Amino acid sequence: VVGGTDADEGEWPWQVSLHALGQGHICGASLISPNWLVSAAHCYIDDRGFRYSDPTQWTAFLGLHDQSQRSAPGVQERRLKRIISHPFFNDFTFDYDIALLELEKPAEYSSMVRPICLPDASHVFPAGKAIWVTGWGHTQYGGTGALILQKGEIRVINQTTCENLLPQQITPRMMCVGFLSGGVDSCQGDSGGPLSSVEADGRIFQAGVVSWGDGCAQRNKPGVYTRLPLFRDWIKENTGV
Numbered sequence: 001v002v003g004g005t006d007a008d009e010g011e012w013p014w015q016v017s018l019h020a021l022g023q024g025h026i027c028g029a030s031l032i033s034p035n036w037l038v039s040a041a042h043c044y045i046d047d048r049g050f051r052y053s054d055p056t057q058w059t060a061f062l063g064l065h066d067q068s069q070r071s072a073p074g075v076q077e078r079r080l081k082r083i084i085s086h087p088f089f090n091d092f093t094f095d096y097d098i099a100l101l102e103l104e105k106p107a108e109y110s111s112m113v114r115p116i117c118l119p120d121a122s123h124v125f126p127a128g129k130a131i132w133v134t135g136w137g138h139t140q141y142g143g144t145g146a147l148i149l150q151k152g153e154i155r156v157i158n159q160t161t162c163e164n165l166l167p168q169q170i171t172p173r174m175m176c177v178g179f180l181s182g183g184v185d186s187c188q189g190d191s192g193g194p195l196s197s198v199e200a201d202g203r204i205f206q207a208g209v210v211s212w213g214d215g216c217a218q219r220n221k222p223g224v225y226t227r228l229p230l231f232r233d234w235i236k237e238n239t240g241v
């Protein structure tokens with residue numbers, strides 16, 4: 001997260017850190033039930049030197065605050081049993097950039113570990129609404145990851161504006177969130193994490209999944225996120241949630 005601040009401990013108890021064995025934190029995710037996380041598909045693509053698509057190569061840390069204190073009280077470590085990448089995910093366009101991760105053992109709910117609410121398929125997160133992005137990604141483009149979880153406030157951008165800022169790249173599964181002036185944005189390592197939106201009674205709903213961007217925090221280049229309402233039924237069908 002660029003242009004953000006340290007989160008308070010336990011402030012985003014649905015925020016999850018995915019580590020690939022021997023590589024440390026690679027992506028974020030969000031806890032949605034005791035057995036399931038939401039993340040981005042693109043985090044689980046093989047490259048010639050590592051099988052990121054193999055669930056056994058991962059560890060999820062729930063209730064984490066500081067990457068250097070992964071054994072702190074309240075942090076829960078879990079392995080993955082399965083990674084379900086959306087069948088329509090396109091690794092070139094990043095369309096349908098969403099995945100479901102099945103925990104090998106259920107998360108134990110606590111003050112530090114709690115699921116985020118999922119929005120109904122018909123819900124519209126309106127243009128202009130303030131929402132939050134969180135993660136341990138880079139704090140400057142080409143910079144370094146954050147040890148302490150970061151948070152940043154960004155706003156939903158009109159889809160036509162989004163499409164015009166990133167020509168031939170924005171599909172209806174995507175949403176631009178940020179500022180045309182730049183300043184606050186997600187960045188490398190924040191991928192897969194949730195956009196958190198404060199709704200009518202203060203409960204937080206997941207608005208989207210961190211997906212990609214052209215650089216980070218640059219003017220006229222807001223971050224691109226996978227929308228969540230569109231996938232409510234897919235999530236229910238594949239997880240029971």
Ligand SMILES: N=C(N)c1ccc(Oc2ccc(NS(=O)(=O)c3ccc4ccccc4c3)c(Oc3ccc(C(=N)N)cc3)n2)cc1
Binds near residue numbers: 043185187191223
């Ligand atoms: N021309 C380029 N070089 C370019 C342009 C766009 C790209 O898109 C990507 C690719 C990988 C990433 N992210 S990611 O964290 O770097 C990433 C990359 C490879 C992975 C492999 C396995 C597992 C996880 C992996 C994770 C990305 O993340 C961003 C970047 C910017 C923003 C933003 N400004 N809001 C948000 C998320 N974005 C990637 C590359």
